[PDB]
Design a protein around this ligand. Structure first.
Ligand SMILES: *[C@@H]1O[C@H](CO)[C@@H](O[C@@H]2O[C@H](CO)[C@@H](O)[C@H](O)[C@H]2NC(C)=O)[C@H](O)[C@H]1NC(C)=O
Ligand SMILES: *[C@@H]1O[C@H](CO)[C@@H](O)[C@H](O)[C@H]1NC(C)=O
Lengths: 402, 274, 99
């Protein structure tokens, strides 16, 4: 419960290129004069009235001690939705009269939530120290940066709340929640898709959903009078690495849009194995075998750090890798190669170790070990004794022969 | 098959080393045919393909002036975005714009692109419907709303469905001897014993154009997609491409496996055995 | 965001000892565009190395191809060493004649 959110009003005029000015949002004014802020421009100091209560409730339970949320304000002019699927929300060309006045779009991002609000300032000398603004549409998500294992489901959260603005004595509409549109798109690496489009409360043809995705798009109730809360949760059945990136969710009402963005990251922990596993060969000097360390089926490809150790010490020997090998599931495999120097008696029982640090892995990483065998004073086996006897017998027989 | 024409603009800021460097390139099927570079000794729009060299000097002077104006605009946008994002002026940041048209084998428009990126991340893009825009942050949404008010998407749709496709067809005709060719791949299998009880079969495809190709490994007609390693398609350096696919198999069982190769230049898909 | 270059080192044609050929290092998928690439023969940088113009991919990344004439020899070894802002020390990838 900050009770105040510092915000950056971003100029929209072409002449001023993304200029920024200080402002504040006063979620809870409380009985009495609001805190004086002579440093702020009067129009950018807002006291927020939320009949729906979504914006208030979002920060009422905000974690203590967390960094202040990043807020940005901008001026908003209602426009009809340009997407063709959302064409039934505004059948008539005439702009609604109830949407007259000034509008502010507020975007508040944080590690715990991402929120967007449409506010209506009141022009309202003496009370100029504060500007009263009422919330109209709020769209928030509590999963602004989901992490999903490869092959698992994603449940991108989305909630919204809508209180219709003052009708200006023009509220001759059907009692009950108004129909709305829900849009879910993806953007990543210069590639965008309309994953899902819905218009709950209105019957029409929507573009087919992609990747078998569905949404819980509905009003939470059908009461005749607002405010109304609603759900827009996104369910992505199986998450492959090609579905990573930015997911944009938009709620559409006639001439009103509310957008939030999420960052979906896909991961898969590597499987590490040191291919030479039969200990090693003799070490009378020189002739060391080359050790291969295979890390298989890990995503993302980048960020993997392979290190060689002697068992703890920094292993010695030439080191290199191999170009990434890409699997059908989208993961990648890598091979490290170590060529140790001439092994001798001093390395008897010492293990060459390959250790992998990856973002998906724990802080310790994953390790593989190969023991370095050396030549010692091993006694002859029974088969060796039999072979010695047979060789001596054959040699003495040959000596007798010649 | 499918063809495309793309134009890339890239402005890279160099604090303390002069004004941002600006590069503009035009590609047909990933082959460049025109280039500009502010670092170049002569700031001119230089053709770099044999199938565009027959055009007149006016087509080059006009482009050079257009690209100088684009360089100034991109430098201004770089400064504005660095200011907005609250980043140090001693760092290096890049602004990229791409626009073009992807046309199918029938010569009819399939897709039209008009995208921007800042520091390698999507900034604002035109959607597949050529009507709306995708913008994530507030700075991009301001431009989105300005463009929607001004109805720039209509002009971009008119251009992409018009001049872009016409020029793509003209290029594909004037340079069909290399743009519309189809070199089949040369293929062979290689055997490498990894351990005493496992081998690796590597299927090669060399010297093929275009780059689009499909390599698969099958065991008695069943795909082995999960257990199949792949190297990305790479340029041989002489206008053709290389690729290979590797499958690990039990020692002794190297005859049931088959490599299936699909490419345009091949009249029929190829089946290869060790 | 920043992306680390992906490196491949190969030859224009299948390697035959005693036959002239081109050795290619293909670096792709990195951001930003500043990058250092060297081709090493037995650990030593090669002087006569050409490269193509910086190229641009639809995914907002860059790629480059360095190449040099060489005659494959059983004794000699070759590698590509790449340094980029996204990696601590230069990464070397060796030229496996059959990979
Ligand atoms: C939006 O809808 C989702 C899905 O219906 C809600 O999540 C479900 O919540 C119920 C009750 O808590 C659980 O039993 C289900 O397991 C949840 N489903 C999933 C897929 O997680 C979600 O709570 C709704 N959002 C709001 C704010 O009402
Ligand atoms: C830029 O970041 C600094 C450091 O956190 C902060 O003090 C300053 O207020 C920021 N400026 C803007 C305009 O956000």
């Amino acid at each position: 419960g900050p009770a105040v959110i510092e915000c950056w009003f971003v100029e929209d005029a072409s002449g001023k290129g993304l200029a920024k000015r200080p402002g504040a949002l006063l979620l809870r004014q409380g009985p009495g004069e609001p805190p004086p802020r002579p440093d702020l421009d009067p129009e950018l100091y807002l006291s927020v009235h939320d009949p729906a209560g979504a914006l208030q409730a979002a920060f009422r339970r905000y974690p203590r001690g967390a960094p202040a949320p990043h807020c940005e304000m901008s001026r908003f002019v209602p426009l009809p939705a340009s997407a063709k699927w959302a064409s039934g929300l505004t059948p008539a060309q005439n702009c609604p009269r109830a949407l007259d006045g000034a509008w502010l779009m507020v975007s508040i991002s944080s590690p715990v939530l991402s929120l967007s609000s449409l506010l209506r300032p009141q022009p309202e000398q003496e009370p100029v120290l504060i500007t009263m603004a009422t919330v109209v549409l709020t769209v928030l998500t509590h999963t602004p940066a989901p992490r999903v294992r490869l092959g698992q489901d994603a449940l991108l959260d989305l909630s919204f709340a809508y209180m219709p603005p003052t009708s200006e004595a023009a509220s001759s509409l059907a009692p009950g929640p108004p129909p709305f549109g829900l849009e879910w798109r993806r953007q990543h690496l210069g590639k965008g898709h309309l994953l899902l489009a819905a218009t709950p409360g209105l019957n029409g043809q929507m573009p087919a959903a992609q990747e078998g995705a569905v949404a819980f798009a509905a009003w939470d109730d059908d009461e005749p009078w607002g405010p109304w809360t609603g759900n827009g949760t996104f369910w992505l059945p199986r998450v492959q690495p090609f579905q990573e990136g930015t997911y944009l969710a938009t709620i559409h009402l006639p001439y009103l849009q509310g957008q939030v963005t999420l960052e979906l990251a896909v991961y898969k922990p590597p499987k590490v194995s040191l291919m030479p596993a039969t200990l090693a060969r003799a070490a009378p000097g020189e002739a060391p075998p080359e050790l291969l360390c295979l890390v298989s089926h890990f995503y993302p490809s980048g960020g993997l750090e392979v290190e060689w150790e002697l068992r703890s010490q920094k292993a010695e020997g030439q080191r290199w890798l191999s170009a990434l090998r890409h699997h059908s599931d989208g993961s990648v495999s890598l091979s490290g190669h170590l060529q140790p120097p001439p092994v001798t008696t001093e390395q008897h029982g010492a293990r060459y170790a390959c250790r992998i640090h990856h973002p998906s892995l724990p802080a310790s990483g994953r390790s593989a070990e190969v023991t370095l065998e050396v030549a010692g004073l091993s006694g002859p086996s029974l088969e060796d004794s039999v072979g010695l006897f047979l060789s001596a017998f054959l040699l003495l027989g040959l000596f007798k022969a010649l | 098959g499918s063809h495309s024409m793309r134009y890339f603009y890239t402005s890279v800021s160099r604090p303390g080393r002069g004004e941002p460097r600006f590069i503009s390139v035009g590609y047909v099927d990933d082959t460049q045919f025109v280039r500009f570079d502010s670092d170049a000794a002569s700031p001119r729009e230089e053709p770099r393909a044999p199938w565009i060299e027959q055009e007149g000097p006016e087509y080059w002077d006009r482009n050079t002036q257009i690209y100088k104006a684009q360089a100034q605009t991109d430098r201004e946008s770089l400064r504005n975005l660095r200011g907005y994002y609250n980043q140090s002026e001693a760092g290096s940041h890049t602004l990229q714009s791409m626009y073009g048209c992807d046309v199918g084998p029938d010569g009819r428009l399939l897709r039209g692109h008009d995208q921007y990126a800042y520091d390698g991340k999507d900034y604002i893009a035109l959607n597949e419907d050529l009507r709306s825009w995708t913008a994530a942050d507030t700075a991009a949404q301001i431009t989105q709303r300005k463009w929607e008010a001004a109805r720039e998407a209509e002009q971009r749709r008119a251009y992409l469905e018009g001049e872009c496709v016409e020029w793509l067809r003209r290029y594909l005709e004037n340079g069909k001897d290399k743009l519309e060719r189809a070199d089949p791949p040369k293929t062979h299998v290689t055997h490498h014993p990894i351990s005493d009880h496992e081998a690796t079969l590597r299927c090669w495809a060399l010297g093929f154009y275009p780059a689009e190709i499909t390599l698969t490994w099958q065991r008695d007609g069943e795909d082995q997609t999960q257990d199949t390693e792949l190297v990305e398609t790479r340029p041989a350096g002489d206008r053709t491409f290389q690729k290979w696919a590797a499958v690990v198999v039990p020692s002794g069982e190297e005859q049931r496996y088959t490599c299936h190769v699909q490419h345009e230049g091949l009249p029929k898909p190829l089946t290869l055995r060790w | 965001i920043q992306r680390t270059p992906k490196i491949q080192v190969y030859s224009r044609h299948p390697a035959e000892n005693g036959k002239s050929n081109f050795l290619n290092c293909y670096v792709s998928g990195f951001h930003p565009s500043d990058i250092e690439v060297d081709l090493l023969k037995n650990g030593e940088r090669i002087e006569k190395v050409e490269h193509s113009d910086l190229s641009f991919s639809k995914d907002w990344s860059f790629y480059l191809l360095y190449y040099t004439e060489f005659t494959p020899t059983e004794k000699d070894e070759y590698a590509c060493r790449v340094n980029h802002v996204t990696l601590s020390q230069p990464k070397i990838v060796k030229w496996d004649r059959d990979m």
